[PDB]
């Protein structure tokens, strides 16, 4: 019950039941852990990257990527994703 199938460095029982990241190793989830400020992560043990973004469920929870990523995207279910539209500020009309 301590074996990793999708090889995301998170054993299946951890991903299935619950886990957080301590000292960059995957430890199982305790409710007293939320005191210091850790978060409860849970993901698909059948997928390298559960959210679908190029980053693996480990990398997301670990926070070991581009640090400019918004922190909520560390949840292996909140996809890291840039959403870009183009707004307009000045509207100039002429006849030239």
Partner 1 sequence: LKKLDAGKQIKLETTQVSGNFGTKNSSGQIVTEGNSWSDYISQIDSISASIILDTENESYERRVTAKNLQDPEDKTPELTIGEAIEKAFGATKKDGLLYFNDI
Residue 18 interacting entry, from Ca ion, partner 1, none, C-beta within 5 to 8 Å by type: none
Q: Of the candidates 65, 42, 41, which has an alpha carbon nearest to the alpha carbon of residue 53? A: 65
> After which residues is the chain discontinuous, taking C to N > 2.5 Å?
none
- Our finding on whether 75 is near Ca ion (CB under 5 A) is no
Query: Was 23 annotated as part of a binding site?
Result: no
CB-based contact 81:51 (threshold 8 Å):
no
Show the site string, 44-73: x = touches partner 1 by CB under 8 A, - = not: ----xx----x-x-----xx--xxx--x--
Annotated binding site for Ca(2+): 4, 6, 8, 10, 12, 15, 44, 47, 57
């Amino acid at each position: 019950e301590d074996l990793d199938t999708d090889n995301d460095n998170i054993p299946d029982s951890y991903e299935r039941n619950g886990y957080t990241i301590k000292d960059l190793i995957a430890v199982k989830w305790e409710d007293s852990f939320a005191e210091q400020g850790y978060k409860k992560y849970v993901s698909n043990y059948l997928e390298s990257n559960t959210a679908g973004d190029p980053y693996t469920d480990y990398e997301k929870a670990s926070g070991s990527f581009d640090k400019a990523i918004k922190t909520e995207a560390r949840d292996p279910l909140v996809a890291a994703y840039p959403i870009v539209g183009v707004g307009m500020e000045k509207l100039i009309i002429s006849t030239n």
